[PDB]
Amino acid sequence: MDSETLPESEKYNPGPQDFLLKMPGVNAKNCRSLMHHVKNIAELAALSQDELTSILGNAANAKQLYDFIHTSFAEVVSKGKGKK
């Protein structure tokens, strides 16, 4: 995080960070871990449960996040087909 004496505060991209900050189960702890190991939400969504679980540190949090990425509100609003 640069050889400057400046904090990273100036260098954050509002859009993608917020995208991650709006994710369920993802508290700031998890967010920081993610911005440390992961570049962007794309890596995140490409990650497997175990991967994201190791980064998040919490199995429960990881489930919320992972499942969300792979689910839809449509499922829950009307379950017509689906194994879950």
């Binding site: 260098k11 991209n13 859009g15 995208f19 900050l21 962007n40 794309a42």
Partner: protein
């Protein structure tokens, strides 16, 4: 009077779907170029996060009268780092 919203399942369902759609709407809403109804439009087209991120700019522009430029903005936030700055794409930066 109506035999619905009677089980605990109804509550689980209602709050889950509500929270789901809320997070999905909000997530797409994080783009300054995207308005709240814009996110709604991505919801009627893909209704899922995986489907959004797996969608390219052209797919996001395919979405009914929503915004080809919005697609450009969405794709950008989807593939841009949170720190905004990379360690090195074509030119290697300080890494730390």
């Amino acid at each position: 009077r109506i035999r619905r919203r009677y089980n605990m399942a109804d509550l689980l369902m209602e709050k889950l779907e509500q929270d789901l759609v809320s997070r999905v709407t909000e997530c797409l809403t994080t783009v300054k170029s995207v308005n709240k109804t814009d996110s709604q439009t991505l919801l009627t087209t893909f209704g899922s996060l995986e489907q959004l991120i797996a969608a390219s700019r052209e797919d996001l522009a395919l979405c009914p009268g929503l915004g080809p430029q919005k697609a450009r903005r969405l794709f950008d936030v989807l593939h841009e780092p949170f720190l905004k700055v990379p360690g090195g794409l074509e030119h290697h930066h300080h890494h730390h």
